[PDB]
Write an enzyme that holds these catalytic residues in place. Structure first.
Site, PDB file in Angstrom:
ATOM      1  N   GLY F  29      44.341  38.522  49.371  1.00 21.43           N
ATOM      2  CA  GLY F  29      43.307  39.528  49.120  1.00 21.43           C
ATOM      3  C   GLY F  29      42.279  39.119  48.079  1.00 21.43           C
ATOM      4  O   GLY F  29      42.387  38.055  47.467  1.00 21.43           O
ATOM      5  N   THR F  30      41.283  39.981  47.877  1.00 23.29           N
ATOM      6  CA  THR F  30      40.216  39.731  46.903  1.00 23.29           C
ATOM      7  C   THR F  30      40.733  39.942  45.482  1.00 23.29           C
ATOM      8  O   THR F  30      41.773  40.565  45.279  1.00 23.29           O
ATOM      9  CB  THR F  30      38.994  40.649  47.128  1.00 23.29           C
ATOM     10  OG1 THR F  30      39.363  42.017  46.909  1.00 23.29           O
ATOM     11  CG2 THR F  30      38.437  40.491  48.542  1.00 23.29           C
ATOM     12  N   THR F  31      39.996  39.426  44.503  1.00 31.02           N
ATOM     13  CA  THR F  31      40.421  39.494  43.105  1.00 31.02           C
ATOM     14  C   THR F  31      40.136  40.870  42.502  1.00 31.02           C
ATOM     15  O   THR F  31      39.034  41.403  42.642  1.00 31.02           O
ATOM     16  CB  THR F  31      39.733  38.409  42.251  1.00 31.02           C
ATOM     17  OG1 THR F  31      39.859  37.135  42.898  1.00 31.02           O
ATOM     18  CG2 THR F  31      40.359  38.329  40.859  1.00 31.02           C
TER      19      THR F  31
END
Lengths: 231, 195, 250, 240, 235, 243, 244, 241
Positions: F29-31
């Site tokens: 996933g994204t940060t």
């Protein structure tokens, strides 16, 4: 492989294959386009027939006076999800005298789809949806995936060969967003967008399906000779 | 409904039941048969609250007919009466009890004996030489106590029954429109068409 | 969630064997030895207190348990399974008997109830069998003294004397030579201590041995006086000192 | 509750549990049904592997569902009892609510429906039973004979057989049964039914059961000697 | 094993796809919609000559204005027919009117995907639902175990379907009479059937606005078969 | 083998492989990050712009629970929404019975027990998200991070997603260089920088920055989104640091 | 999920057999032999206990013969614990019938009921079947003396003489040879013990390895008596018939 | 080989899922120790905070179950907190129903019974934790009762749990072999904590700072945990003799 027998199993790389397979059913489905300006929102859908004796499968479903969607994938799953949206729109109107916000409708669809991806016995939904609507914050377009992911967009397309229409809308972004107070021109842009996804076949009078909602325009579906004007 | 009588003689059981059906102000019918054949040699007459009477009787009939088919065998009058008693005893502590009183007249083919059972809506069972429900016993029992013999013929039983009905027709305020009389013996069940 | 294992986990194999029951019996075989001997005026049940660590207080772990005032139980196999069975056995003695008849159940019927519970864990959905064999000793007015064995299958048998677990085969042979129908309770305790010494490796004393009897009524353990018909429990657990006294006359 | 889908489709579009239930029927003793002009006869095979049997008390192969309808079967005996009980309950329920006994077709349609239900309900297996249901509709003199199977399909037959070696006796019936002129009497119908079983049975002794159903709830089972007389007459004509 | 509601890597439900194979093994059923009515025809396919063929019921009435033909595991159709009849009658009770043919079809198709671990498997039968209502006139629908239904001018299902559908492709036009449709169903059934077509192994039916749903007598169909034979010999 | 095919099965190691596979979805996933400041907390997340057709500022990721708790997560977004919906039910029932808004440690355990419960049975799948959350209660500011196993701890700073290693290193510098503490306004600026720095692991597509905060002095202990001038100021500060 | 671990106890084989029923019957073939013989003046039940010990308390022991009511008894072959579950259910059914109709339950009706319970475990529920075969010995005033058997499939049949458990093939052949219709109880007692003595896997047939019972109208006048034999009484009948 | 996935017997009469749950118990790599004084019960546990971004005050494996009962856990924190919440609920319910404080040994038995159920029922997995309950019981005095994933439990004079439990166990054994009594003959709990820390240092062969340890103390009518500064005062006293 060994991890695609049910929706309750992650793969070693953290993938959910049953969900990915459900996503594949959308790619087999017929193309449908969505786009909006600041005053109106439009759905365009290429309907698919079984053969020359058969009718063309309907793609667009009305959810309320101010909201509706188009489908690509398993049609019965779209009926279940659209029925749920009809009920939720209806609950909002009856209990709160309030038209359901399009963004909140997207949140509800996400949560309903999610439960089918984390439990044993069930299966993911096998359909993708493009929801358009006009509420208190103007025109809206949503894209629903049966993974649960719902996204708000200016324009998009789903189904087979949808990449061609999506690139066209990405080029035309600055033009069609400015088409305010002109329903016909916004539909023209949508018909031109879906044309970038056609091969061998062209848009005929019983092939094309168009829907529109806007500032002073209830959600209405156009089929038959009502779309000959745009062919 | 109103009057139901029973008498067990030497070789048969005789049941007499009134023909009138009254809904408050009017007599709607004067030929009503207040009985159901449960098996070839077992008859049940009934009286109580409207609707519940026929509903209960037909329910019992269905169950005994089901047993007869399943086992290819006719239950004894004693066994049938016990089944009926339990159903009424169950019913009295229900949400809405069956308000139904019954007489069960049967000929036991194994023992070669007639048998008469009296059961009220509470599930109170007694085996008797003669019986009744409601006010019928108040008028008829003094005559039955006097004349009854265990060795009476069927014809003598009918004559004693006629005397009972005559006393009812004299002293009862309600017009019950006569009685249908049925005999239960070794050959089965038959109706006396002139009474 | 929900328990979605509504199917049997014990099933017949082609040879007619019930695998899970056989495997439960194998777990019992690995368990520490326990035994029971019936005398004319009593019954004795005994086992070794195999302490897992010397820092552990083995007095807090009871292998021999009171089920009713006149019935006791000992086991071989999985300790935790035994503990929960003792809880269920104590309760079922009340719910299915004492609350109905106003008296404690006879030994054979309490055994029958425990057996039923063990049978059901062999057929019901989503469970394994109990990994224990029980020895249940008891007394009641009309049957006198009795001793029963209960296995993982739910099968039970009455014994004059028997042993279960680790060294049961050797122990049963030892008991066959010594048992007769004229034994007094003290003789049975003596034979129990002799038999148990053979299967014990290390220390053999009152602190490492657990022993209880079903014998005479103990009015001193009743906790009250005034009711002539109430004369006290027949179950009594022997103390560490009482065991050591009989180990000198061994 | 146990919800497991035992009856499911296979890649070739077959439901194996239903098809394997038919294999249980193939193993069962042979049953045959023949309708005459004014009667229906049900014949049944009794395997003589079991002697020292008490024939008075042993469950008979033909069962009365009502006074005017009978049911025979091939397949699992224990399974058949459940269908027979349900059919008997429904027969009395029909009399209670409609005030008329069941038609033979209605009773067949009910039993067939129960069988179908057990092919797409969770946690259950199909019945390993096929049935022959025969009788006469109330106040009707036209003979009725129906067949059901594990899948739940049912149909009417002029004559039919089920169970082991039913392929052989169906072969016999197909060449010996004339539709334009069915067995005009009870004698002719019983004779043709015994003849059809003699193609498969072995000894004509206690191996053949015969039940005759006539109009107006007239049902009787033939005895050993009565059947033995048919067996005798058939072979004496055959010696020619 | 594997879930009953499992998706394949192609995005199709295994069980639904397998039930479609069972339908391919079923006897042929054909429907043709005209402006004068809709015709429904079936192959009876008796397994033996001793089987009384008039007890084979593969064409069924749902209401006066709606008929239905089946192909596949025909036992599975019984609960579907029961639901259809109940839905048709219930709507009349609630609304004092006839139910639309499409709405009836949609109600039947809602049952289809109600399977899992509800019923244990999909239906193994396909339906041709024909009828008439005031809004959309004469209609023919094809109801599948996937829950999908298509409207058709003409449609064939069962074992001889793709050969029959190709034939229907050439023969259907928007000016067909009812009589022309009857002969056309008979012609195509005769083409794809194993055994020789007659009034005992094939069955016709129709739905008209005036007379409603009617299953044809064997005597009536026999005449139409004789009429077919003569007109094919006419050139 | 076969121990990894079913949830709640212990491997011969004593590991639940299905939970470890859920972590892989989180790492994909994204940060997203969280910073604990002097009198509150700051949350920030990377939003990948997949296409020009995405409406800017519309697809909001950070979620509020009650009025004092913020939640952000990386991994399967729907799973995160399901967890927040439960959290909102837990917070509502707590306030219903006890009147006071749910304390952050109390709220942390409610999410923890619920996530842990999805590791007890094979009839359910573990959560495919790691959730960073927190806010202000009567005892001050609290920051938590919760994993698919149900494991959670309190944090000075927290990070998850594809660029978590980069983010963690940046957070560790702030802890060392500010033992006395960080202000809420400083934390917003720093949060913007860290997301921009962590975007190097997702450098193919451009992104949109989203920040929220709860502070006793700046937001009266309520969760609010950073908007307009304050957001632009943080974007400018971030862009200046990467160049 | 859980499907992975499901054995599916209620499915057909390709040949149309029920796996679990067949395997349960295999289990029962290793159980001690039980024999029932019906005579004109009564019924005999004889059964062999499985390899016992000298320390087993025989006089209080029961593993084979059980009383269902005053008129009906059963001999057990298979898992004893499974049998006791069904036996208790049968005892309750008999009392339910007696309460309802005020008559003792006919033998076949009790047998059909227990057999239907066994059948259910083979068709639905996903549970293992009961590994038990029963011989029912009983009397009622309709059919008189009756012998039945039931097995894990839920199928039941009537018999003049029958065996269950181990060596039934050998036992049934011996019974078929010496059984006659006009036989009496005392003769049937001898036949049963002689058959067990020849079919047993033990070295010799003794009193401590047997359970024995008779149902006789040898009850004073028009009634029936059940007699569960005591250890000493089994020892005496063994001497009387000349086996020991 | 599905007998290894769920809690059914293997051909050797073993439950592999239970055995593997015991292995998960050592996943945290933490050792704990418990001892009894005259008036108190002390439990110490190693504290490891490997990440600088963590808030060290929230990292704990000691739980206050009730006013009188404390619990230290050996195993992963999710299962630890699961057991902690349940123990707290059980202790509170006991007091409400029976009108007195739940004893330490009774709570241990209850949690052991719950664990036993997970070894017999297939749908529930065992918790990968070992639970050491401590208190000063009003009837039994200082008490240590320990539960494991098999559903086993027993009382202890003293006990140790973790990867290096054997070293600590033997060290404790040797001390009680000398003293010939079942407890630490000391008046104050402070000195009993000092004993506990000293003997852990000796057994593991490692020195401890104030942040390397975690201490819980049970006295009559209360259980409490020590702060870092309270532990520091303990460490100073140990070093000064």
């Amino acid at each position: 492989n060994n991890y695609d027998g049910d929706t309750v199993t992650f793969s070693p790389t953290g993938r959910l294959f049953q969900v990915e397979y459900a996503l594949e059913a959308i790619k087999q489905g017929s193309v449908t386009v969505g786009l909006r300006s600041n005053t109106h929102a439009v759905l365009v859908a290429l309907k698919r027939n079984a053969d020359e004796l058969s009718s063309y499968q309907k793609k667009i479903i009305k959810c309320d006076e101010h909201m509706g969607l188009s489908l690509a994938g398993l049609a019965p799953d779209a009926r279940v999800l659209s029925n749920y949206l009809r009920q939720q729109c209806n609950y909002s109107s009856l209990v709160f005298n309030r038209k359901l916000a399009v963004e909140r409708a997207g949140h509800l669809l996400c949560d309903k789809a999610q439960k089918n991806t984390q439990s044993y016995g069930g299966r993911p939904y096998g359909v993708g949806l493009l929801i358009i609507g006009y509420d208190k914050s103007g025109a809206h377009l949503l894209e629903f995936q049966p993974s649960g992911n719902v996204t708000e967009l200016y324009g998009t397309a789903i189904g087979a060969r949808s990449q061609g229409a999506k690139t066209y809308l990405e080029r035309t972004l600055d033009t069609f967003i400015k088409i305010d107070g002109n329903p016909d021109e916004l539909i023209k842009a949508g018909v031109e967008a879906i044309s970038q996804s056609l091969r061998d076949e062209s848009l005929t009078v019983d092939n094309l399906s168009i829907a529109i909602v806007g500032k002073d325009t209830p959600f209405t579906i156009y089929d038959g000779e009502a779309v000959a004007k745009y062919i | 409904m109103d009057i139901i009588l029973g008498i067990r003689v030497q070789d048969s059981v005789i049941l007499a039941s009134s023909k009138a059906v009254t809904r408050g102000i009017s007599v709607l019918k004067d030929s009503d048969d207040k009985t159901r054949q449960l098996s070839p040699h077992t008859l049940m007459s009934f009286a109580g609250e409207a609707g519940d009477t026929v509903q209960f009787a037909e329910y019992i009939q269905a169950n005994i007919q089901l047993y007869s088919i399943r086992e290819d065998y006719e239950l004894s009058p004693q066994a049938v009466s016990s089944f009926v008693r339990q159903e009424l005893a169950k019913s009295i502590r229900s949400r809405r009890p069956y308000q139904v009183n019954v007489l069960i007249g049967g000929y036991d083919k194994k023992k070669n004996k007639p048998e008469l059972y009296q059961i009220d809506y509470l599930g109170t069972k007694v085996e008797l030489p003669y019986g009744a429900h409601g006010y019928s016993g108040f008028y008829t029992f003094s005559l039955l106590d006097h004349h009854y013999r265990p060795d009476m013929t069927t014809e003598e039983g009918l004559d004693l029954l006629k005397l009972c009905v005559q006393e009812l027709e004299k002293r009862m305020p309600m017009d019950f429109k006569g009685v249908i009389v049925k005999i239960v013996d070794k050959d089965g069940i038959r109706q006396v068409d002139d009474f | 969630m929900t328990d979605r294992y509504s199917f049997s986990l014990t099933t017949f194999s082609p040879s007619g064997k019930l695998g899970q029951i056989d495997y439960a019996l194998t777990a019992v075989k690995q368990g520490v030895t326990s035994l029971g001997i019936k005398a004319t005026n009593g019954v004795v049940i005994a086992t070794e207190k195999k302490s897992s660590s010397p820092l552990a207080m083995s007095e807090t772990l009871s292998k021999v348990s009171l089920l009713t005032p006149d019935i006791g139980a000992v086991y071989s196999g999985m300790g935790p399974d035994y503990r929960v069975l003792v809880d269920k056995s104590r309760k079922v003695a009340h719910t299915s008997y004492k609350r109905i008849y106003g008296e404690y159940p006879p030994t054979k019927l309490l055994v029958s109830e425990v057996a039923k519970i063990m049978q059901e864990a062999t057929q019901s959905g989503g469970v394994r069998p109990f990994g224990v064999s029980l020895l249940i000793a008891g007394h009641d007015e009309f049957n006198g003294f009795s001793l029963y064995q209960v296995d993982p299958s739910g099968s039970y048998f009455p014994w004059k004397a028997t042993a279960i677990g680790k060294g049961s085969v050797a122990a049963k042979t030892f008991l066959e030579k010594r048992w007769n129908d004229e034994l007094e309770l003290e003789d049975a305790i003596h034979i129990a201590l002799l038999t148990l010494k053979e299967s014990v490796e290390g220390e053999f004393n009152g602190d490492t041995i657990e022993l209880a009897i079903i014998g005479d009524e103990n009015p001193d353990l009743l906790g009250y006086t005034g009711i002539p018909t109430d004369k006290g429990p027949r179950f009594r657990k022997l103390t560490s000192q009482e065991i050591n006294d009989r180990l000198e006359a061994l | 509750g146990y919800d497991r889908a035992l009856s499911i489709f296979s890649p070739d579009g077959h439901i194996f549990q239903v098809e394997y239930a038919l294999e249980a029927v193939k193993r069962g003793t042979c049953a045959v049904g023949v309708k005459g002009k004014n009667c229906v006869v049900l014949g049944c095979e009794r395997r003589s592997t079991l002697k020292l049997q008490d024939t008075r008390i042993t469950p008979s192969k033909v069962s009365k569902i009502d006074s005017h309808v009978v049911l025979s079967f091939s397949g699992l005996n224990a399974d058949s009892r459940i269908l027979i009980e349900k059919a008997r309950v429904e027969a009395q329920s029909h009399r209670l609510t409609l005030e008329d006994p069941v038609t033979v077709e209605y009773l067949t349609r009910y039993v067939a429906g129960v069988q179908q239900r057990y092919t797409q309900s969770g946690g259950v297996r199909p019945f390993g039973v096929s049935t022959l249901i025969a009788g006469f509709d109330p106040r009707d003199d036209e003979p009725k004979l129906y067949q059901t199977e594990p899948s739940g399909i049912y149909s009417s037959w002029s004559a039919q057989t089920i169970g082991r070696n039913s392929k052989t006796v169906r072969e016999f019936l197909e060449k010996n049964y004339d539709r334009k002129e069915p067995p005009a009497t009870v004698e002719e119908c019983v004779k043709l039914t015994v003849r059809s079983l003699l193609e498969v049975v072995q000894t004509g002794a206690k191996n053949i059961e015969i039940t005759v159903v006539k109009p107006d709830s007239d049902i009787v089972a033939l005895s050993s000697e009565e059947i033995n007389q048919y067996v005798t007459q058939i072979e004496q004509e055959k010696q020619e | 094993d594997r879930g009953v509601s499992t998706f394949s890597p192609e995005g199709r439900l295994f069980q639904v796809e397998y039930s479609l194979e069972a339908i391919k093994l079923g006897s042929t059923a054909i429907g043709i919609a005209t402006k004068e009515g809709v015709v429904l025809g079936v192959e009876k396919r008796a397994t033996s000559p001793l089987l009384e063929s008039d007890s084979i019921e593969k064409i069924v009435e749902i209401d006066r204005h709606i008929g239905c033909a089946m192909s596949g595991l025909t036992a599975d159709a019984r609960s579907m027919i029961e639901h259809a009849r109940t839905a048709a009658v219930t709507h009349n009770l609630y609304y004092d009117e006839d139910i639309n043919v499409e709405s009836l079809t949609q109600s039947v198709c809602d049952l289809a995907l109600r399977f899992g671990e509800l019923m244990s498997r999909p239906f193994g039968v396909a339906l041709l639902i024909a009828g008439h209502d005031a809004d959309d006139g004469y209609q023919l629908f094809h109801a599948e175990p996937s829950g999908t239904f298509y409207r058709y001018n003409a449609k064939a299902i069962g074992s001889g379907s793709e050969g029959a559908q190709a034939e229907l492709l050439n023969e259907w036009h928007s000016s067909l009479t009812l009589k022309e449709a009857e002969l056309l169903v008979l012609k195509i059934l005769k083409q794809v059937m194993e055994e020789k077509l007659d009034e005992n192994n094939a069955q016709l039916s129709c739905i008209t606005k005036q007379d409603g749903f009617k299953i044809y007598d064997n005597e009536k169909t026999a005449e139409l078969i004789k009429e077919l034979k003569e007109k094919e010999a006419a050139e | 083998t076969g121990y990894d095919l079913s949830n709640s099965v212990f491997s011969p190691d004593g590991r639940n492989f299905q939970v470890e596979y859920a972590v892989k979805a989180v790492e994909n996933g994204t940060t997203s990050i969280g910073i604990k400041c002097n009198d509150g907390v700051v949350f920030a997340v990377e939003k990948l712009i997949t296409s020009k057709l995405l409406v800017p500022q519309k697809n909001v990721k950070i979620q509020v629970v009650d009025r004092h708790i913020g939640c952000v997560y990386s991994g399967l977004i729907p799973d995160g929404r399901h967890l927040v919906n439960r959290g909102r039910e837990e917070a509502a029932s707590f306030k219903k019975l006890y009147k006071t808004p749910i304390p952050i440690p109390a709220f942390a355990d409610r999410l923890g027990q619920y996530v842990q419960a999805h590791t007890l049975y094979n009839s359910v799948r573990p959560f495919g998200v790691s959730t960073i959350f927190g806010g202000v209660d009567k005892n001050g500011a609290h920051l938590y991070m919760l994993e698919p196993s149900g494991s959670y701890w309190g944090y000075k700073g927290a990070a998850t997603g594809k660029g978590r290693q980069s983010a963690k290193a940046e957070l560790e510098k702030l802890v060392d260089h500010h033992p006395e503490g960080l202000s809420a306004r400083e934390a917003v600026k720093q949060a913007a920088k860290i997301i921009y720095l962590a975007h190097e692991d997702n450098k193919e597509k451009d992104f949109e920055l989203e920040i929220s905060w709860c502070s006793l002095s700046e937001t009266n202990g309520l969760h609010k989104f950073v908007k307009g001038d304050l957001l632009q100021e943080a974007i400018d500060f971030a862009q200046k640091e990467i160049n | 999920g859980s499907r992975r671990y499901d054995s599916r106890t209620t499915i057909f084989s390709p040949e149309g057999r029920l796996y679990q029923v067949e395997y349960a019957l295999e289990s029962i073939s290793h159980a001690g032999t039980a024999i029932g013989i019906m005579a004109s003046d009564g019924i005999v039940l004889a059964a062999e206990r499985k390899v016992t010990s000298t320390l087993l308390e025989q006089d209080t022991s029961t593993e084979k013969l059980y009383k269902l009511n005053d008129k009906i008894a059963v001999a057990v072959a298979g898992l004893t614990a499974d049998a006791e579950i069904l036996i208790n259910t049968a005892r309750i059914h008999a009392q339910n019938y007696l309460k309802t109709y005020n008559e003792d339950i006919p033998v076949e009706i009790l047998v059909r009921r227990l057999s239907d319970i066994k059948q259910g475990y083979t068709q639905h529920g996903g549970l293992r079947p009961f590994g038990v075969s029963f011989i029912y010995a009983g009397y009622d005033d309709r059919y008189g003396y009756q012998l039945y058997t039931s097995n894990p499939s839920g199928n039941y049949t009537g018999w003049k003489a029958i065996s269950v458990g181990a060596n039934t093939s050998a036992a049934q052949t011996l019974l078929q040879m010496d059984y006659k219709d006009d036989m009496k109880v005392d003769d049937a007692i001898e036949l049963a013990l002689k058959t067990l003595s020849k079919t047993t896997d033990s070295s010799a047939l003794t009193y401590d390895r047997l359970e024995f019972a008779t149902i006789r109208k040898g009850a004073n006048d028009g009634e029936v008596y059940q007699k569960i034999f005591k250890p000493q009484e089994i020892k005496d009948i063994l001497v009387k018939t000349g086996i020991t | 080989g599905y007998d290894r996935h769920i809690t059914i017997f293997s051909p050797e009469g073993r439950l592999y899922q239970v055995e593997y749950a015991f292995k998960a118990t050592n996943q945290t790599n933490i050792n704990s120790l418990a001892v009894r004084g005259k008036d108190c019960t002390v439990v110490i546990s190693q504290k490891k905070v490997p990440d600088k971004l963590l808030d060290p005050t929230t990292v704990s494996y000691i739980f206050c179950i009730s006013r009188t009962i404390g619990m230290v856990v050996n195993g992963p924190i999710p299962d630890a907190r699961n057991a902690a919440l349940r123990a707290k609920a059980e202790a509170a319910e006991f007091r409400y129903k029976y009108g007195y404080d739940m004893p330490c040994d009774v709570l241990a038995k209850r949690m052991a019974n719950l664990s036993q159920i997970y070894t017999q029922r297939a749908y529930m997995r065992p918790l990968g934790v070992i639970l050491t309950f401590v208190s000063v019981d009003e009837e039994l005095g200082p008490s240590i009762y320990k539960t494991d994933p098999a559903g086993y439990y027993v009382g202890y004079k003293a006990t140790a749990t973790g990867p290096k439990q054997q070293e600590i166990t033997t060290n404790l054994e040797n001390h009680f072999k000398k003293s010939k009594i079942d407890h630490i003959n000391e008046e104050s709990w402070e000195k009993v904590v000092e004993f506990a820390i000293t003997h852990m240092i000796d057994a593991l062969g490692t020195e401890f700072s104030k942040n390397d340890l975690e201490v819980g103390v049970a006295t009559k009518d209360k259980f409490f945990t020590l702060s870092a500064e309270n532990i520091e005062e303990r460490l100073v006293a140990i070093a000064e003799q």
